[PDB]
Every structure is written in C-alpha cells, then in structure tokens.
C-alpha cells in the first residue's frame, strides 16, 4: 500500500473492453481493486482478451465467429466502437467513423476499418450495466450507484423494475437459486418445500426448496414456487425462484410515487420525507436471522454440565426451557433472556457457578432452530469439549426514521420524517404521493437520468407495459430518449382518457395540491414512478451509549467497542479544539476523572449521587505506566 | 446595541445581501439578536420555498437554437486546416494549435449565448433561478448540462484534439464516456491522496507553535511593518481597507491633502476608520505586528490586536498559536489544483475600405503560432487606413501581429489585427 | 422565565467585564456557594439550577 502510487491507480488506454473504468472503491483502495468487463475472458497464458467482428469492404460480417484479441494484437488495426449503426446488419452507414489506432482516437472513412466491437456495453461491468439512461449521468455518480446497488437488502415481497435495462435475467441465473424445468411436460405435485414435474412418459423430476436459511451477513435465503398443480410447462421455463428475484430476473427495490419539490425543511441537504403507507403496507420490510453458540468444555477442577438447575434464579425466569436447559422452538425472547443454562465447577456446600448464555442487549425475535451436537453420537468436536448448542433467532424489521435509502443513479438519503397520509401532497385524482425529493440535488451533481426514469415509469404504470431500454441509445437518432419518453406519455394520455396526465406546455409536470390546507401550489411539479432500494445501513445497529463499564488491564482506561460497552475516543484534534476555546476545566475533567484516575472515578460518582461537590483529581495511571516503562530501559 | 433603525431594502435578495444583513445586525445589535434574526429568516425562506413549487424537468434544460450552425462553421474551419496540412503547407505542431484554438473559442461563444438566452426568455426558470441566486449551482455545471463539455485531457497532461460536443441532456457517445472517465478517475485519486499530506502539515504546524500564549499587555516599541494593498500591476487583488482591520498603528497617520490627523499612535482600526483611510488616498500604513514585537518568548496584547471571532482586543491568556495553526490548516483539502482565447484580442474592422498602411509602422515578416504569415510590430503606431467613409484611428501595441498589408480589400467584420492584452518561452 | 431571557442576560454579563475568562470563574464560584448554602433543609426555590440562579442574581446586581 505504501509503495503503490499515482501511476498504478490510473486508467490506461489498454484497459478498453477488459477492465471497467467506473467500478472502484473510494478512499485508500481507489484504483487498487478492479472489476472484469462484460465480454472479457482470460486465455491460458494469463492475458485478458475481448471479441470483435470482421469488416470486409465496409461490410460487417456478423456471421463469421467473432475473434478474441489481446491488448498488444489490436495496436496496428483500426478498431471501431460498438455504437456504429448499420443498415441491414451489413454496410456501415455514414461518411466519417471514429477509430482507435495505436492508443489514439482518430476518424477515418468506413472503407478502411478492420474490426468492430460486439456490443455497446462491452466496456462496462455487470453492476454498471444495470443502470438505464447511463449516458446522461456523470461518472462519479455512476460509480456511487453501481457501488450502492450491491448493498441492498432482499425484501419481503420483491418486484421487478418497470424501466429495466435488459440484463436482469442474466445477472440472476448465476447465483444458482432459480429453478427451470428441463422437461416440457406437466406438473403433478406442488408444495412449499417440494415440486414434481412429469414428462411425456419420461419419468419424474423432483426438486426440494430451501426455506429461511441464513447468509454470511444475516439475511434470509428463502425459495418459493410459482406454478400451480396440473400446469402445462415448456422447457427452460422458470419453476421456482429465490428471495431476491421476481420471475426469472433480479428484483432489489420497489416502484413508488415520487415528486420533486421542497417540503417545509424536511428535504434539506439529502434528507428524505416518506409517507406512512410504506410502513403498514409492508413495503421495505426484511427478515434477518442471527446465530448464537455455547460450548460445554472440561476443566481440571471438573467437567461442565448443561442443565436447568441454575443457582440464584427463580422459576419466573425458567418458563421456556425444555427441562434439559435449552430453550424451545417458537418462543419469543427479549433482551437478557436465558437461552442455554450452564454451570461451571468452581473451587471454594455448592461449588458451581452460573455463566449461562443470554441474548445480547438490543436483540429480540423468534427461536427457529436449536440444532445441537454431542459425542457418543458420531459428531466430531473440538478437543476437550462435550457438546455444542446452536440457536437461531429471526426478526422482521420495518423502515423507520434514520434508515438509508438509495436509487440506481447515485442519489442517497436518510429518512427524517414519516407523515400520515392526509398530510402528503396529492394528485388531481386524490392519490397521495409516496416520497418527496429535493430538486436542489440534481443540477449540481448531473444525474439527469433519474428524471427520464421517473417519466418513463409514470407512462409504464399508466399503460401496464414494463419497458426495457439499453444504454447508449442515441446511435439511432439525435435525441432518442426524449422522443421515446414524450411519445409514450402522449400514448398513455390518449389511451387512459384523462387529460391531466400529460400537458404540452409543461411536458413532465402536473398540478399538485396541499393536504393540510387544500390549496394548490403556485407552479406544477414533476411526478413519476421511481425504483428505490433499502440499504444495509440501519439505525438499529449504529446507536450506542455508556456511563460506566469495563476497563483495560494495563492502562486502566475504558474499553472500546460497541459489543463490549465501550467508550468514545477523544483524540488530539479535539484536545486542540478545546484548547482554542480557552477551556481548562472541561479538558481536565475529561482527562482524569472520566478516563483513568483510578481513585477519582469512585469519588466523583459518589459525590454526584450524594449531591456534594466533586473533589480535585490526582495523577492518571498512564503517566505512571510510562515512567515504569522508561525506567525499565 | 440598539437605536439603529433598519433600512427598507427595496431590491432582490440573494446570498450576498443576506450575508451583508447578518453582518450589519451583528455590528449594531449584538450576538443574541443575530441568532433571532437568522432563525426568522430561515423560517420565512422554508415557508415560501414550498409555496412556489420549484421543481426540475427535462424541458427546463433549455439549449440555445444556434448550436448546430456554430458547430457547422467550426467543422468547416477544421476541414480547411486539415486540408492545408495534407498538402504540406503547414507543419504538425501548427495544425494542433489551430484545431485547439478553434474549439477553445467556440466554447466561449456558446457559453455567452447560453447565459444570454437564460436571462431573456425565461428569467424565472428553475435552473436559472437556483443557480443565479447563489443557492447551489455554478457556471461550469450549467455549461455541461445545456452547452458543451469541451476539450479534455489524457491520463497524462496532454490534450485530446477530439472534443465533446454534447451535453448531459443530449447524451454522450461511447467514445466520449471514456474521455470523461479519465478525468473522473484522476480527480478521485487526487482527493484520496491529498488528505494525508494536509493532515501531516497541520500536525507539524500545531507542534511548532503551541507555546504562543498572550501574557503581556505592552512591550513598548516603535517598530512595525508597512501595510499596502495587494495588486497585480494594473489590477488590485486585495484592497488596503480589508488588510487594515483590527491592526494597531505604530505611528500617527495623516491625510495627504492637509494636516488633518486621522489616527494617533497605538490605536486599533475599525471598519469605519479603515474605509476613511482608504478613501482619502494613502498607500502605506505602518502597524505593529507579531513579527517585530520584542516580548518574552510570546506576543503581547498590543502587537497582536483584535481577535477576529469577537471583534475586540485579545484577552489575557489566549492560545493564539493553536488558532493560527488551525486557521492555516483547515482549507488545505480545498486546494484542488485550451490555449490563447480572449486573453488576446482580435481586431476586426466593421467597414469596407482600402488599405493605407504604407511603410509607417515597422512591419517585419513573421510566422505566427498557426501556419499563417503576418507582420510583427513593436513600435506603437496609430493605424491609418482608408475606411470607406472616413479614415482609421486604430492604435496598435508593442509586440502586436497585423494580418492586413497594403493593397488589400477589407470587408465587413474581416480580421484586421491581433493585440496582446496585459513570458516563459519553453522548449 | 425563558431560555431567550437567559441568553440575553448572559450576553449582558459578558459585556461590562473587561475579560471573558474572568466572568466564568466568578459565576462558577457564586453557583457553588449557592448550592452549598442551600444545605439547610428548607428548599429555597430549589426548582432553578445553581448556574442559572447565579446568572440571574449577577444580572440583577448589574442594575
């Protein structure tokens, strides 16, 4: 890391079609980790290749087995991009054609090109290929959106986008969670855990489905069937699908009504204002499963026994144990509840001590699995151990104030308010909106594609159409996206019969009223259908507080860490800031009484509780530790 | 901290007016009334930005209707240049300069047309209203949405002669996306790597100057420096009044018209006195400074002067070293660091008349930065030319380049001369 | 009793002082003395906190 410099983190002209120029981290790892492009492949020497079609006399031979070429080979040839337009999958149209010759960009007559790229998306990766209207976005926000698409959470009921890009069904077939029928036959048995399909006198095919499993990051891994009993089925047809796919294709977010306008300060600087329908309609709710473990070991004093005869506990805290010391499946556990009861043979009558495992503070849910393993049963265990017990606890989480939401075009935000549905602005038909977004964030960051997406989603909802648009779509016309969106909106207006849907004076804008007073806003605003995602950064996992807890052994300073009641660090930049204020007493109280003055801590606490004055501090322990360490040298 | 009635501001209120009003309120009423005024303004703005219904659309992004003809003319000029190059009339280092200059001038013309179009057709446009008011937008960002992206650079420092001739409204091509990604990655890595340098510099600054605390009231000296405005020759960059606020005078200043005194020895300067000194001439004022104060291993209260956060003389026992280090180090991460266009000036005569140059000025043949040949002039001489109705009174400058020689026919808005506006010759 | 009134009173105390760091110490001393003298089990206006009480008393003494 210390030796890599400016030259290794750059973009070389030889990365074209082999390494994506967009998807990277931000920070210390920017430019040091990359992603393979869509069509690239590695040969047996270890070099990345990419495919091309041959051009003979200005005619593209799309029927002659595209050739794969490495970076050094394609330096003497004149290679054309994948967005050039042909008339009948044949001769190249136009009079001047952009080409690359020896790592430079030039233009030539189209009787002198040699090879043509296969597709317009040959230069980007798979995550960046899922952003519609990408050519109307900046590159930094494209990086943000591609990075944030991989932090979304699978929802309770997934749903396909209306303005997808065409690569969704291929990005889902590699995870191996979608089941397709190889049969072309009939379906004879459907169940929540089993499917069976019978051919035309070709035996039976049976599939078993995984149910509510757990991933590395504590997310569910369900699988559900689509078909009904006695259904005609063709080969290659989807039969069951996973937890993050609708029928065949990826589904990470939801389509909601959006308007672009400021509220009464609740949209300020990337904050998000949502409605209460998203809470009671179970939109944006997810299932998270956790795993807890306890080990029964043996000691020189004696062995350890798992039992419900725990000392110093009453029967009011042993309701849900199964007379063997282990909780029962289907029980609701709140914080500080016993899961498995264990006693250790202490040396001191009763000689056992209680250290049974309990749920950590801030965790609750249902118990769904209590699988347990032991010796004398064919199970391998770590040495010196007698039994292992694993408990699985599940819960359902809803959207709430403090959660992060995102879109495909790089627009992030934190939810700040949840309004009842009579306060939200509403349409000329009475429908309240779902989300209000600030228009100040669009022109200074140059995400113009989100407006295109919103307008096309509005048209698609009104037509029930589900369009698909591929990136770099302007090789066919001068302004293809605008013309397609306008034509779709006009067609929706003619088909529906409602004239307020589309206006010619302000194409993308319609009238909106105030739910609190009933008066219309002065000017029309932009409304549409947006596809938004819920990220893994939830506020239930970011809040922490401490008054007094464990301390370090050597320095006698508070421990650090959320999982062990840790304190917040007061670095030296904050010390400089407090010195610039003229503060002397806040700083001295922070440095001694609240950190490592081993005798002043108890005195301060007792003085506060009793109501007296806090006495003067002494010398902190770290200075004495340093003096001892220097003397030892 | 009262008795000063506000003035009725009968004008539009952008960000500069709000900053001026906040400053006036602090100067006249105190530190607890400014908070109340700011809260009231915040409430009013939040209330009336919602009743307006400000939004953003695709038709709000208005592109001027003359872009196509401008691009056509530029491409015709480029074709002429490349046809001259192919026949051997010009060398390779001149074709690059010509094609770079054409696309550098076309972008300026397009930007002017965009700005003029916004302020005439739709002056309440949402993009125009939110960029002109000083809320969030810029001019280098409005340019790329409705204008033209322009000439970009290699992963090295070189320049690609292929420009981007589309905005984000029309949509880039596959070739232009790569050229943009070059600069995007360069900026990302720059931002990643600047933070460590800035942090190390700030730490070194803090440790060098931590012991500078104010302990004394006065060292009793007579030394100081001379404060003058910061000027780049003809133009001034920082006026003297902005540089003279909070300082303490080491000698009595005098008006240069008579014997009226404006300040005695040892007197701090406020805004009113700074303006009074600036208005009545005077180019240098001698002031005290921490550079020249002879105290015991620190500064004194009189040599330092005002504390800028409070608009008062510094208190006793104030840590000025930490403040100085933090003030120098805070803007460190904001140091984010095309050819001759309007930095020169072409002279075009809007008349049709014969040439009367003769042999008055010193016309030496010269080969300019492009492939053309002209006459280089160093003797400042007033051009004399028969301009149809009346003669010419045009004035050349030293080092100018004149294209028109005698025995020519000048037409309407034909190129006549080039004047450098007010030196490193590299290899 | 409002928070705005306390803010205005504290600003007025800061002025008429000649030193910003010398008034905080006086306020702290007065507050500690008031809280300590409150030890008599009569609860004389215990509702107000000692620092705000010291600020109010010193503002009243300013006339």
């Amino acid at each position: 890391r210390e030796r890599a410099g400016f030259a290794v983190r750059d973009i070389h002209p030889s990365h074209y079609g082999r390494i994506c120029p967009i998807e990277t981290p931000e920070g210390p790892n920017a430019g040091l980790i990359g992603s393979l492009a869509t069509h690239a492949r590695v040969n047996d020497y270890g070099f990345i290749e990419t495919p091309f079609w041959r051009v003979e006399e200005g005619r593209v031979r799309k029927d002659l087995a595209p050739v794969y070429m490495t970076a050094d080979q394609e330096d003497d040839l004149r290679v054309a991009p994948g967005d050039v337009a042909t008339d009948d999958a044949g001769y190249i149209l136009g009079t001047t054609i952009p080409v690359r010759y020896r790592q430079d960009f030039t233009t030539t007559t189209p009787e002198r090109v040699d090879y043509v790229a296969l597709s317009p998306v040959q230069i980007i990766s798979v995550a960046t290929s899922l952003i519609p209207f990408l050519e109307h976005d900046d590159a930094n926000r494209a990086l943000m959106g591609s990075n944030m698409q991989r932090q979304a959470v699978p929802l309770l009921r997934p749903e396909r986008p209306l303005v997808g890009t065409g690569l969704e069904p291929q990005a889902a077939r590699d995870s191996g969670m979608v089941i397709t029928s190889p049969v072309d036959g009939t379906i004879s048995y459907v169940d929540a855990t089993h499917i069976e399909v019978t051919a035309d006198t070709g035996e039976k095919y049976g599939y078993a489905l995984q149910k509510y499993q757990r991933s590395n990051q504590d997310t569910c891994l369900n699988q559900r069937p689509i078909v009904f009993e006695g259904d005609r089925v063709q080969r290659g047809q989807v039969i069951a699908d996973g937890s993050a796919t609708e029928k065949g294709e990826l589904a990470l977010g939801q389509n909601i009504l959006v308007a672009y306008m400021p509220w009464e300060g609740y949209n300020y600087e990337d904050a998000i204002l949502i409605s209460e329908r998203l809470v009671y309609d179970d939109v944006y709710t997810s299932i998270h499963i956790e795993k807890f473990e306890i080990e029964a070991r043996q000691t020189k004093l004696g062995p350890e026994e798992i039992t419900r005869e725990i000392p110093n506990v009453g029967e009011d805290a042993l309701r849900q144990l199964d007379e063997n010391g282990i909780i029962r499946v289907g029980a609701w556990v709140e914080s500080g509840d016993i899961l498995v009861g264990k006693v250790t043979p202490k040396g001191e009558a009763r000689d056992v001590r209680d250290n049974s495992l309990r749920v950590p503070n801030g965790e609750k849910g249902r118990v769904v699995d209590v699988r347990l393993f032991t010796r004398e049963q064919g199970d391998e265990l770590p040495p010196g151990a007698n039994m292992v017990v694993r408990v699985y606890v599940a819960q359902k989480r809803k959207i709430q104030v403090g959660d992060k939401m995102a879109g495909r075009h790089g627009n992030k935000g934190i939810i700040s308010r949840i309004l009842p549905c009579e306060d939200m602005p509403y349409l000329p038909d009475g429908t309240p909106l779902d989300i209000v977004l600030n228009p100040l964030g669009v022109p200074s960051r140059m995400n113009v594609g989100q407006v295109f997406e919103c307008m096309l989603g509005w048209a698609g909802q009104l037509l029930d159409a589900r369009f698909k648009v591929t990136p770099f779509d302007e090789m066919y016309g001068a302004e293809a996206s605008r013309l397609t969106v306008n034509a779709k909106l006009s067609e929706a207006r003619e088909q529906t019969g409602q004239p307020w849907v589309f206006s010619d004076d302000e194409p993308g804008k319609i009238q909106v009223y105030d739910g609190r007073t009933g008066e219309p806003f002065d000017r029309p605003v932009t409304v549409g259908r947006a596809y938004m995602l819920k990220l893994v950064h939830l506020v239930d996992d970011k809040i922490h507080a401490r008054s007094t807890g464990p301390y370090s052994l050597v320095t006698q300073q508070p421990l650090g860490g959320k999982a062990q009641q840790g304190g917040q660090r007061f670095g030296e930049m904050e010390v400089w800031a407090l010195e610039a204020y003229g503060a002397a007493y806040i700083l001295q109280e922070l440095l001694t009484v609240k950190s490592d003055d081993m005798q002043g801590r108890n005195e301060a606490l007792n003085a506060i509780v009793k109501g007296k004055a806090i006495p003067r501090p002494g010398t902190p322990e770290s200075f004495k530790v340093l003096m001892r360490e220097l003397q030892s040298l | 901290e009262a008795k000063s009635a506000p003035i009725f501001r009968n004008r539009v209120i952008d960000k500069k007016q709000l900053k001026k009003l906040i400053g006036w309120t602090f100067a006249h009423y105190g530190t607890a009334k400014t908070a109340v005024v700011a809260d009231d303004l915040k409430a009013l703005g939040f209330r009336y930005a919602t009743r307006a219904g400000v939004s953003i659309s695709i038709d709000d992004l208005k592109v001027p209707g003359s872009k196509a003809e401008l691009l056509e003319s530029a491409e015709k000029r480029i074709q002429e240049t490349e046809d001259r190059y192919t026949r051997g009339e010009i060398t390779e280092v001149e074709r690059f300069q010509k094609v770079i200059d054409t696309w550098a001038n076309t972008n300026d013309e397009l930007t002017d047309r965009v700005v003029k179009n916004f302020r005439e057709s739709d002056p309440l446009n949402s993009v125009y209203m939110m960029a002109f008011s000083g809320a969030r937008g810029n001019i280098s960002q409005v340019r790329q949405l409705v204008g033209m992206r322009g000439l970009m650079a290699n992963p090295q420092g070189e320049i690609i002669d292929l420009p981007i001739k589309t905005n984000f409204r029309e949509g880039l091509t596959v070739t232009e996306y790569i050229i943009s990604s070059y600069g995007a990655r360069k900026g990302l890595v720059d931002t990643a790597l600047r933070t460590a340098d800035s942090g190390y510099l700030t730490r070194r600054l803090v440790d060098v100057s931590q012991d500078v605390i104010i302990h004394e009231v006065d060292c009793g000296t007579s030394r100081g420096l001379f404060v003058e405005a910061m000027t780049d020759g003809d133009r001034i960059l920082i006026p003297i009044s902005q540089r003279l606020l909070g300082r303490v005078t080491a000698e009595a200043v005098l008006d240069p018209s008579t014997d009226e005194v404006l300040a005695e020895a040892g007197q701090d300067i406020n805004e009113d006195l700074a303006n009074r000194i600036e208005k009545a001439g005077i180019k240098k004022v001698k002031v005290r400074s921490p550079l020249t104060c002879e105290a015991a291993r620190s500064v004194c209260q009189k040599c330092y002067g005002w504390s800028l956060a409070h608009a008062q003389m510094v208190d006793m026992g104030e840590a000025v070293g930490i403040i100085a280090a933090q003030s120098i180090g805070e803007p460190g991460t904001q140091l984010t660091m095309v050819f001759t266009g309007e930095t020169a000036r072409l002279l075009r005569a809007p008349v049709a008349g014969t040439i009367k140059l003769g042999k008055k000025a010193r016309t030496r043949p010269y080969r300019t930065r492009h492939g053309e040949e002209a006459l280089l002039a160093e003797a400042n001489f007033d051009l004399v030319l028969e301009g149809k109705g009346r003669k010419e009174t045009f004035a050349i400058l030293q080092g100018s380049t004149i294209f028109v020689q005698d025995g020519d026919k000048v037409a309407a808005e034909a190129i006549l001369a080039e004047v450098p506006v007010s030196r490193t010759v590299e290899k | 009793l409002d928070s705005q009134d306390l803010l205005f009173k504290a600003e007025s105390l800061i002025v008429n002082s000649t030193n910003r760091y010398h008034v905080t110490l006086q306020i702290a001393r007065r507050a500690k003395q008031a809280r300590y003298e409150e030890m008599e089990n009569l609860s004389e206006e215990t509702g107000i906190k000692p620092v705000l009480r010291a600020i109010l008393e010193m503002s009243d003494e300013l006339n």
Partner: peptide
C-alpha cells in the same frame, strides 16, 4: 505537558 500529567493548562480559564 500539563495535558500529559493532567494539570490545568496555562491558557484560558486556567491562566491564573
């Protein structure tokens, strides 16, 4: 150096 030991700094309210 007073920060390391844990004393009142000689600047501000700890001046005297």
């Amino acid at each position: 150096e007073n920060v390391i030991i844990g004393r009142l700094i000689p600047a501000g309210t700890g001046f005297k």
